[PDB]
Design an enzyme around this catalytic site. Structure first.
Site, mmCIF file in Angstrom:
data_model
loop_
_atom_site.group_PDB
_atom_site.id
_atom_site.type_symbol
_atom_site.label_atom_id
_atom_site.label_comp_id
_atom_site.label_asym_id
_atom_site.label_seq_id
_atom_site.Cartn_x
_atom_site.Cartn_y
_atom_site.Cartn_z
ATOM 1 N N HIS A 76 0.811 -1.218 0.000
ATOM 2 C CA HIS A 76 0.000 0.000 0.000
ATOM 3 C C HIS A 76 0.847 1.273 0.000
ATOM 4 O O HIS A 76 0.314 2.341 -0.319
ATOM 5 C CB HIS A 76 -0.998 -0.058 1.167
ATOM 6 C CG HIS A 76 -0.444 0.312 2.507
ATOM 7 N ND1 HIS A 76 -0.137 -0.625 3.465
ATOM 8 C CD2 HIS A 76 -0.246 1.520 3.084
ATOM 9 C CE1 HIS A 76 0.275 -0.015 4.560
ATOM 10 N NE2 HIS A 76 0.216 1.290 4.355
ATOM 11 N N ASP A 100 -0.154 -7.550 1.528
ATOM 12 C CA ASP A 100 0.324 -6.168 1.580
ATOM 13 C C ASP A 100 1.849 -6.092 1.642
ATOM 14 O O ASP A 100 2.411 -5.299 2.400
ATOM 15 C CB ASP A 100 -0.294 -5.421 2.767
ATOM 16 C CG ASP A 100 -0.154 -3.902 2.651
ATOM 17 O OD1 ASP A 100 0.150 -3.412 1.540
ATOM 18 O OD2 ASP A 100 -0.381 -3.192 3.676
ATOM 19 N N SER A 158 4.426 2.205 8.462
ATOM 20 C CA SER A 158 4.239 0.943 7.766
ATOM 21 C C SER A 158 5.537 0.575 7.068
ATOM 22 O O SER A 158 6.262 1.441 6.565
ATOM 23 C CB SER A 158 3.086 1.005 6.761
ATOM 24 O OG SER A 158 3.380 1.743 5.595
HETATM 25 C C1 LIG Z 1 -3.244 -0.769 -2.258
HETATM 26 O O1 LIG Z 1 -3.330 -2.167 -2.112
HETATM 27 C C2 LIG Z 1 -3.420 -2.570 -0.780
HETATM 28 C C3 LIG Z 1 -3.113 -4.030 -0.430
HETATM 29 C C4 LIG Z 1 -3.213 -4.524 1.002
HETATM 30 C C5 LIG Z 1 -3.619 -3.505 2.080
HETATM 31 N N1 LIG Z 1 -3.702 -4.001 3.446
HETATM 32 C C6 LIG Z 1 -4.091 -3.051 4.444
HETATM 33 C C7 LIG Z 1 -4.200 -3.497 5.900
HETATM 34 C C8 LIG Z 1 -4.382 -1.596 4.066
HETATM 35 O O2 LIG Z 1 -4.744 -0.738 5.100
HETATM 36 C C9 LIG Z 1 -4.469 0.621 4.756
HETATM 37 C C10 LIG Z 1 -3.216 1.049 4.833
HETATM 38 C C11 LIG Z 1 -2.859 0.978 6.258
HETATM 39 C C12 LIG Z 1 -2.106 1.965 6.966
HETATM 40 O O3 LIG Z 1 -2.444 3.102 7.101
HETATM 41 N N2 LIG Z 1 -0.848 1.489 7.547
HETATM 42 C C13 LIG Z 1 -0.038 2.306 8.464
HETATM 43 C C14 LIG Z 1 0.831 3.406 7.880
HETATM 44 O O4 LIG Z 1 1.595 4.030 8.541
HETATM 45 N N3 LIG Z 1 0.704 3.593 6.470
HETATM 46 S S1 LIG Z 1 1.650 4.802 5.805
HETATM 47 O O5 LIG Z 1 3.089 4.576 5.974
HETATM 48 O O6 LIG Z 1 1.348 6.117 6.404
HETATM 49 C C15 LIG Z 1 1.127 4.965 4.098
HETATM 50 C C16 LIG Z 1 -0.370 5.144 3.755
HETATM 51 C C17 LIG Z 1 2.160 5.660 3.224
HETATM 52 C C18 LIG Z 1 1.970 4.133 3.148
HETATM 53 C C19 LIG Z 1 0.658 1.798 9.727
HETATM 54 C C20 LIG Z 1 -0.519 2.756 9.867
HETATM 55 C C21 LIG Z 1 -0.396 4.016 10.742
HETATM 56 C C22 LIG Z 1 -1.472 4.709 11.158
HETATM 57 C C23 LIG Z 1 -2.922 4.312 10.824
HETATM 58 C C24 LIG Z 1 -3.575 5.476 10.047
HETATM 59 C C25 LIG Z 1 -5.103 5.223 9.936
HETATM 60 C C26 LIG Z 1 -5.345 4.017 8.983
HETATM 61 C C27 LIG Z 1 -5.815 2.809 9.843
HETATM 62 C C28 LIG Z 1 -5.895 1.548 8.982
HETATM 63 N N4 LIG Z 1 -6.276 0.428 9.791
HETATM 64 C C29 LIG Z 1 -6.739 -0.829 9.211
HETATM 65 O O7 LIG Z 1 -6.949 -0.971 8.040
HETATM 66 O O8 LIG Z 1 -6.916 -1.810 10.206
HETATM 67 C C30 LIG Z 1 -7.612 -3.023 9.933
HETATM 68 C C31 LIG Z 1 -8.977 -2.683 9.291
HETATM 69 C C32 LIG Z 1 -7.858 -3.698 11.294
HETATM 70 C C33 LIG Z 1 -6.835 -4.015 9.019
HETATM 71 F F1 LIG Z 1 -7.733 -4.971 8.643
HETATM 72 F F2 LIG Z 1 -6.401 -3.398 7.886
HETATM 73 F F3 LIG Z 1 -5.779 -4.664 9.608
HETATM 74 C C34 LIG Z 1 -4.498 1.265 8.448
HETATM 75 O O9 LIG Z 1 -3.553 1.096 9.179
HETATM 76 N N5 LIG Z 1 -4.309 1.178 6.991
HETATM 77 C C35 LIG Z 1 -5.233 1.362 6.016
HETATM 78 N N6 LIG Z 1 -4.307 -1.097 2.718
HETATM 79 C C36 LIG Z 1 -3.918 -2.070 1.719
HETATM 80 C C37 LIG Z 1 -3.830 -1.560 0.277
#
Ligand SMILES: COc1ccc2nc(C)c(O[C@@H]3C[C@H]4C(=O)N[C@]5(C(=O)NS(=O)(=O)C6(C)CC6)C[C@H]5/C=C\CCCCC[C@H](NC(=O)OC(C)(C)C(F)(F)F)C(=O)N4C3)nc2c1
Ligand SMILES: [Zn+2]
Length: 199
Positions: A76, A100, A158
């Site tokens: 992601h 992911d 992440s």
């Molecule tokens: C595009 O193809 C794909 C393929 C697989 C994916 N698999 C997933 C899992 C996916 O979730 C997305 C992406 C991820 C995400 O924000 N990560 C982090 C990050 O820091 N990111 S980041 O570095 O700023 C950046 C945005 C630049 C890269 C560590 C997070 C820090 C703070 C949380 C902010 C609020 C978001 C909460 C959400 N909570 C959540 O979904 O929890 C549940 C529902 C329980 C589950 F079930 F997910 F576990 C959440 O964490 N996220 C939503 N998107 C995907 C997209």
């Protein structure tokens, strides 16, 4: 139209989380203009050091972690992008949208974490701000923060590691479990899943 179709730039290493001594701290190794240029050319001649890199695209910044000679991060963040290297863009050697997960060969000069076989549930999450957050493992892919934090604290981490007490890699930080904006728990990609992907 076809002649003007653009290409996506490479992921660029822009710093690291320094874990080499007593104090964890973030270091920036490339400023914004070098990053934009390096993203377009894919040519990054900076020397890479350490296990946890800070990486950027034109639109996002997140982390990447070397384990077993592979630099791993989240799909992601990186999508299917190449990563910049001294001699040009490097294609992913692992891509799994269902996990992911993506990976490239680890950069020359990086060091890799060792996969954890301790079977311990007292873990430590390393953030892009070089915070080391105690996390209790709660299942195969989840752990609870001993002190919950607003999701703002974890945004952009992440791709970072969860480590055991001995500093082995237990997993890659994937998502935050948030209640009213407070992260009480995190989801991670277990290192066993990385090792299966490597096969
Ligand atoms: C595009 O193809 C794909 C393929 C697989 C994916 N698999 C997933 C899992 C996916 O979730 C997305 C992406 C991820 C995400 O924000 N990560 C982090 C990050 O820091 N990111 S980041 O570095 O700023 C950046 C945005 C630049 C890269 C560590 C997070 C820090 C703070 C949380 C902010 C609020 C978001 C909460 C959400 N909570 C959540 O979904 O929890 C549940 C529902 C329980 C589950 F079930 F997910 F576990 C959440 O964490 N996220 C939503 N998107 C995907 C997209
Ligand atoms: Zn261990």
């Amino acid at each position: 139209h076809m002649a003007s179709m653009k290409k996506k730039g490479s992921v660029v290493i822009v710093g690291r989380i320094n874990l080499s001594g007593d104090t964890a701290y973030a270091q920036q190794t490339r400023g914004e203009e070098g990053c934009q240029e390096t993203s377009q050319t894919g040519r990054d001649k900076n020397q890479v050091e350490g296990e946890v890199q800070i990486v950027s695209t034109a639109t996002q910044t997140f982390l990447a972690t070397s384990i077993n000679g592979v630099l791993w991060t989240v799909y992601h963040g990186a999508g299917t992008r190449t990563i910049a290297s001294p001699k040009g863009p490097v294609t992913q050697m692992y891509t799994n949208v269902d996990k992911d997960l993506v990976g490239w060969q680890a950069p020359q000069g990086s060091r890799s974490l060792t996969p954890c076989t301790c079977g311990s549930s007292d873990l430590y999450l390393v953030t892009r701000h070089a915070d080391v957050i105690p996390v209790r493992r709660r299942g195969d892919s989840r752990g609870s923060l001993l002190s919950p934090r607003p999701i703002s604290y974890l945004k952009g981490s992440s791709g970072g590691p969860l480590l055991c007490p001995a500093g082995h890699a237990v997993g890659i930080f994937r998502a935050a479990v948030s209640t009213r904006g407070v992260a009480k728990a995190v989801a991670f990609i277990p290192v066993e899943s990385l090792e299966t992907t490597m096969r």
